Design an enzyme around this catalytic site. Structure first.
Site, PDB file in Angstrom:
ATOM      1  N   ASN B  10       0.854  -1.166   0.000  1.00 12.03           N
ATOM      2  CA  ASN B  10       0.000   0.000   0.000  1.00 12.03           C
ATOM      3  C   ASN B  10       0.909   1.241   0.000  1.00 12.03           C
ATOM      4  O   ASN B  10       1.422   1.627   1.057  1.00 12.03           O
ATOM      5  CB  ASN B  10      -0.917   0.014   1.213  1.00 12.03           C
ATOM      6  CG  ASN B  10      -1.799   1.231   1.223  1.00 12.03           C
ATOM      7  OD1 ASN B  10      -1.843   2.010   0.274  1.00 12.03           O
ATOM      8  ND2 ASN B  10      -2.546   1.429   2.333  1.00 12.03           N
ATOM      9  N   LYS B  12       0.090   4.183  -0.346  1.00 14.45           N
ATOM     10  CA  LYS B  12      -0.595   5.348   0.192  1.00 14.45           C
ATOM     11  C   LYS B  12      -0.417   6.496  -0.757  1.00 14.45           C
ATOM     12  O   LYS B  12      -0.370   6.326  -1.991  1.00 14.45           O
ATOM     13  CB  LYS B  12      -0.287   5.613   1.644  1.00 14.45           C
ATOM     14  CG  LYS B  12      -0.489   4.392   2.511  1.00 14.45           C
ATOM     15  CD  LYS B  12      -0.284   4.667   3.979  1.00 14.45           C
ATOM     16  CE  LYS B  12      -0.432   3.367   4.760  1.00 14.45           C
ATOM     17  NZ  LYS B  12      -0.320   3.565   6.203  1.00 14.45           N
ATOM     18  N   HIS B  94      -9.591   0.964   4.700  1.00 16.70           N
ATOM     19  CA  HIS B  94      -8.351   1.269   5.407  1.00 16.70           C
ATOM     20  C   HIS B  94      -8.647   2.271   6.519  1.00 16.70           C
ATOM     21  O   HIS B  94      -9.504   3.149   6.364  1.00 16.70           O
ATOM     22  CB  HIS B  94      -7.330   1.815   4.420  1.00 16.70           C
ATOM     23  CG  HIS B  94      -5.944   1.810   4.941  1.00 16.70           C
ATOM     24  ND1 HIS B  94      -5.456   2.772   5.735  1.00 16.70           N
ATOM     25  CD2 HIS B  94      -4.960   0.915   4.764  1.00 16.70           C
ATOM     26  CE1 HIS B  94      -4.284   2.557   6.088  1.00 16.70           C
ATOM     27  NE2 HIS B  94      -3.877   1.420   5.521  1.00 16.70           N
ATOM     28  N   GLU B  96      -7.291   4.819   7.720  1.00 19.64           N
ATOM     29  CA  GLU B  96      -7.121   6.163   7.199  1.00 19.64           C
ATOM     30  C   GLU B  96      -8.413   6.678   6.631  1.00 19.64           C
ATOM     31  O   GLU B  96      -8.779   7.823   6.860  1.00 19.64           O
ATOM     32  CB  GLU B  96      -5.928   6.384   6.301  1.00 19.64           C
ATOM     33  CG  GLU B  96      -4.640   6.238   7.083  1.00 19.64           C
ATOM     34  CD  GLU B  96      -3.437   5.750   6.266  1.00 19.64           C
ATOM     35  OE1 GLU B  96      -3.488   5.754   5.016  1.00 19.64           O
ATOM     36  OE2 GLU B  96      -2.439   5.362   6.905  1.00 19.64           O
ATOM     37  N   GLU B 166      -5.314  -4.847  10.867  1.00 19.06           N
ATOM     38  CA  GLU B 166      -4.293  -3.788  11.092  1.00 19.06           C
ATOM     39  C   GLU B 166      -4.716  -3.064  12.342  1.00 19.06           C
ATOM     40  O   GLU B 166      -5.573  -2.163  12.309  1.00 19.06           O
ATOM     41  CB  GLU B 166      -4.157  -2.829   9.933  1.00 19.06           C
ATOM     42  CG  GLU B 166      -3.982  -3.503   8.597  1.00 19.06           C
ATOM     43  CD  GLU B 166      -3.598  -2.520   7.547  1.00 19.06           C
ATOM     44  OE1 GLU B 166      -4.320  -1.631   7.173  1.00 19.06           O
ATOM     45  OE2 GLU B 166      -2.410  -2.652   7.099  1.00 19.06           O
ATOM     46  N   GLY B 172       1.906   2.907  10.841  1.00 19.08           N
ATOM     47  CA  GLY B 172       2.796   4.044  10.693  1.00 19.08           C
ATOM     48  C   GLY B 172       3.504   4.478  11.952  1.00 19.08           C
ATOM     49  O   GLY B 172       4.243   5.468  11.918  1.00 19.08           O
ATOM     50  N   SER B 212       3.223  -1.585  10.668  1.00 22.28           N
ATOM     51  CA  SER B 212       4.648  -1.570  10.965  1.00 22.28           C
ATOM     52  C   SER B 212       5.375  -2.882  10.631  1.00 22.28           C
ATOM     53  O   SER B 212       6.404  -3.159  11.207  1.00 22.28           O
ATOM     54  CB  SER B 212       4.917  -1.091  12.403  1.00 22.28           C
ATOM     55  OG  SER B 212       4.376   0.222  12.614  1.00 22.28           O
TER      56      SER B 212
HETATM   57  C1  LIG Z   1      -1.995  -1.628   6.196  1.00 20.31           C
HETATM   58  C2  LIG Z   1      -1.304  -0.473   6.884  1.00 20.31           C
HETATM   59  O1  LIG Z   1      -1.169   0.480   5.783  1.00 20.31           O
HETATM   60  C3  LIG Z   1       0.246  -0.452   7.086  1.00 20.31           C
HETATM   61  O2  LIG Z   1       1.018   0.876   7.161  1.00 20.31           O
HETATM   62  P1  LIG Z   1       2.278   0.565   7.877  1.00 20.31           P
HETATM   63  O3  LIG Z   1       3.192   1.937   7.343  1.00 20.31           O
HETATM   64  O4  LIG Z   1       3.026  -0.575   7.246  1.00 20.31           O
HETATM   65  O5  LIG Z   1       2.336   0.677   9.304  1.00 20.31           O
END
Ligand SMILES: *C[C@H](O)COP(=O)(O)O
Ligand SMILES: *C[C@H](O)COP(=O)(O)O
Lengths: 249, 249
Positions: B10, B12, B94, B96, B166, B172, B212
């Site tokens: 991902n 992002k 997600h 987010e 998650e 993050g 992470s």
């Molecule tokens: C699925 C989550 O996007 C993972 O973000 P991480 O930067 O890997 O913590």
């Protein structure tokens, strides 16, 4: 002595690669013989296709939205990412996003500010609802929306701003504003800009109308002295966008 | 007898065309010698570039979000548009987007349902917050999120579903879940699926961990019996994603 007009195609969440190929060829084969900035705003995933196919020199490509910064914002596209891929126009604050997608005046204003700082041309959308119209609040609403944006801008940033007045009740509904309705709002907006931002800024500012513009109603709208072109949704998916462009002559 | 693992990137809201070109070449030059579905989810505007450059046969391309239907949704990308451009994987729900962008359980469930109907493989994200964790609500939360999704799915649709657990506090933040923490949740999720959806469905279902993950912690996570791979954010922007893939061997 109107400023350079704009004819902007907001394709919204529509298209296939075959349909876009065909429509872009239509746009390409239409020779435009006057000074006008044409804009096409495809969905994000279609930007590369349009960049590859669109050749008409009167056009630029715009995003339909953005967020200000890159980072951990799954699903979003940032202003730096757009700049890097060659997109330096963006539509911000479309009613659809104010209504469906949480964009308050504060959020729209912040986005517009950030876009200007990053060198975008910004089509910032404002407009009242049917209930606001019927409550005699049109002027209060559009001035509040515009003031919110203005509060985050320097005077110089306005050279990058285009306002799009789109009464919400006219968007997609087949109920266009009359020329008189649109002109009344554009006049009051320009006066506000003149008095609050600057007389130079106001004279140069493009104030576009949107909401059920089509090829048959565009020229009479454009004849009004404070209307500088159009933000076009449904009609911009069709070959008759050519005549909307030519209605800005 | 675990099902086929997934290693999903991902990205992002990150990338430039130069950075993506470089990273895709890294991915391409990494020979993968085991059965694994690799996924890369670029921003929408980067999908065409990735489609043009990515050649590693273990990969597919995913969107980071979508809406169900085309139409008057300025700024959004729909599932039919993605299908037409050749994208048939999508990440939905997600954190987010649940957090920043209004996606309730109902909205996530509806999107997942619509994606399955349109033939997508769906990486559906679930997970508890730090406050939920500390309130001993982890299981209640992830089961409620999963049940909401399940309520809109037929049994057969599950063949298209991948769950990504998650914990929000791990996304993050540099605080990965321990192998024991992740396994406990994956076990309870799989049991719920077994009992509420079907024992066959549960045995085949990929339940990925994210939050992470990096190349140094991935293999010990993958050693747990109910962990089927990873949804990777920050580390997926780096060459060490290669070793995350290989940690699913
Ligand atoms: C699925 C989550 O996007 C993972 O973000 P991480 O930067 O890997 O913590
Ligand atoms: C700016 C508004 O998008 C226009 O949509 P319409 O379909 O032209 O009403």
């Amino acid at each position: 002595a109107k400023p350079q007009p704009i004819a902007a195609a907001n394709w919204k969440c529509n298209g296939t690669t075959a349909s876009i190929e065909k429509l872009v060829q239509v746009f390409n084969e239409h020779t435009i013989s006057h000074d006008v900035q044409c804009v096409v705003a495809p969905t994000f995933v279609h930007i590369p296709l349009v960049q590859a196919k669109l050749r008409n020199p009167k056009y630029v490509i715009s995003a339909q939205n953005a967020i200000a910064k890159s980072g951990a914002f799954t699903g979003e596209v940032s202003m730096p990412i757009l700049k890097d891929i060659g997109v330096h126009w963006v539509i911000l604050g479309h009613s659809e996003r104010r209504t469906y997608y949480g964009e308050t005046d504060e959020i729209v204003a912040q986005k517009v500010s950030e876009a200007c700082k990053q060198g975008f041309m910004v089509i910032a959308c404002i407009g009242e609802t049917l209930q606001q119209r019927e409550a005699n609040q049109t002027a209060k609403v559009v001035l509040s929306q515009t003031s919110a944006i203005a509060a985050k801008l320097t005077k110089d940033a306005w050279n990058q701003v285009v306002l799009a007045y789109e009464p919400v009740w006219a968007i997609g509904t087949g109920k266009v504003a009359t020329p008189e309705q649109a002109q009344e709002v554009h006049l009051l907006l320009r006066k506000w800009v003149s008095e609050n931002i600057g007389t130079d800024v106001a004279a140069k500012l493009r104030i576009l109308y949107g909401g059920s513009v089509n090829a048959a109603n565009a020229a009479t709208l454009y004849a009004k002295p404070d209307i500088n072109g159009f933000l076009v949704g449904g009609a911009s998916l069709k070959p008759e966008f050519r005549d909307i462009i030519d209605a800005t002559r």
